[PDB]
Amino acid sequence: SISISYSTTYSGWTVADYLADWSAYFGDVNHRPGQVVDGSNTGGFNPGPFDGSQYALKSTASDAAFIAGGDLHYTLFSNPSATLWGKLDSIALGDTLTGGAGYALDSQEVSFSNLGLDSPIAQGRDGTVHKVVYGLMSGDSSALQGQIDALLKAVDPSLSINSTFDQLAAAGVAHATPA
Ligand code: HEM
Ligand SMILES: [Zn+2]
Numbered sequence: 130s131i132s133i134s135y136s137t138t139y140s141g142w143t144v145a146d147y148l149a150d151w152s153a154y155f156g157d158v159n160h161r162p163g164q165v166v167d168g169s170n171t172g173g174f175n176p177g178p179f180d181g182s183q184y185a186l187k188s189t190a191s192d193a194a195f196i197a198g199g200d201l202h203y204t205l206f207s208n209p210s211a212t213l214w215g216k217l218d219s220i221a222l223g224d225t226l227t228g229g230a231g232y233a234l235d236s237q238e239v240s241f242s243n244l245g246l247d248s249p250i251a252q253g254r255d256g257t258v259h260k261v262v263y264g265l266m267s268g269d270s271s272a273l274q275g276q277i278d279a280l281l282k283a284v285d286p287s288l289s290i291n292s293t294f295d296q297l298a299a300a301g302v303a304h305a306t307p308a
């Protein structure tokens with residue numbers, strides 16, 4: 130079942146409000162045709178170069194960053210091209226990316242783990258893993274939100290992305306860490 134870690138700063142926040150805030154502050158890195166710049170808005174894999182247990186990306190607007198964890202593969206130019214696929218077990222959100230091939234966030238705000246998301250290569254860019262991560266890269270947490278909402282309801286059908294982190298802690302899903 131999904132497990133969430135949150136800084137006590139966010140106890141009274143809803144998951145949706147947190148995600149919409151973080152995504153707006155991270156912004157859109159403009160990873161799209163004609164706009165990809167190696168070393169600026171590609172992010173990186175650990176161990177990489179195009180596969181690993183982590184994919185991490187820093188904002189180009191702010192100090193926000195995220196780390197996706199699991200078993201992740203990027204097809205680059207191979208068919209189906211520009212597809213991230215594999216198993217997505219976790220998403221960590223916060224600021225100030227450190228490390229590398231592991232990555233960590235200096236300020237880890239919220240992490241969602243045991244996501245259990247998996248997308249085979251055959252689904253291409255329509256895979257859930259691709260859509261969740263590419264959404265974050267593009268300033269849009271909607272895909273992530275939809276997956277979190279379904280996972281929460283699978284544990285306890287009255288929970289949702291409009292639950293506060295404290296409500297999720299009372300339901301046994303979330304765990305606070307010191308600010
Ligand atoms: C090491 C990391 C990455 C590198 C070096 C990389 C490189 C590139 C390059 C060079 C392009 C431009 C290709 C073109 O438009 O012809 C591109 C486009 C794209 N990338 Fe990435 N990328 C990386 C990570 C990712 C990740 C993690 C995702 C998804 C979660 C992704 C999704 C896309 C998408 C959807 C496009 C547009 C594809 C198209 O329109 O043909 N990329 N990438
Ligand atoms: Zn955009």
Ligand SMILES: [Zn+2]
Binds near residue numbers: 162
């Ligand atoms: Zn192209």
Ligand SMILES: [Zn+2]
Binds near residue numbers: 200201202215
């Ligand atoms: Zn694999």
Ligand SMILES: [Zn+2]
């Ligand atoms: Zn493998």
Ligand SMILES: [Zn+2]
Binds near residue numbers: 223224238
């Ligand atoms: Zn922050």
Ligand SMILES: [Zn+2]
Binds near residue numbers: 248249
């Ligand atoms: Zn599957």
Ligand SMILES: [Zn+2]
Binds near residue numbers: 285286287288
């Ligand atoms: Zn219930």
Ligand SMILES: [Zn+2]
Binds near residue numbers: 287
């Ligand atoms: Zn109930």
Ligand SMILES: [Zn+2]
Binds near residue numbers: 304
């Ligand atoms: Zn706990």
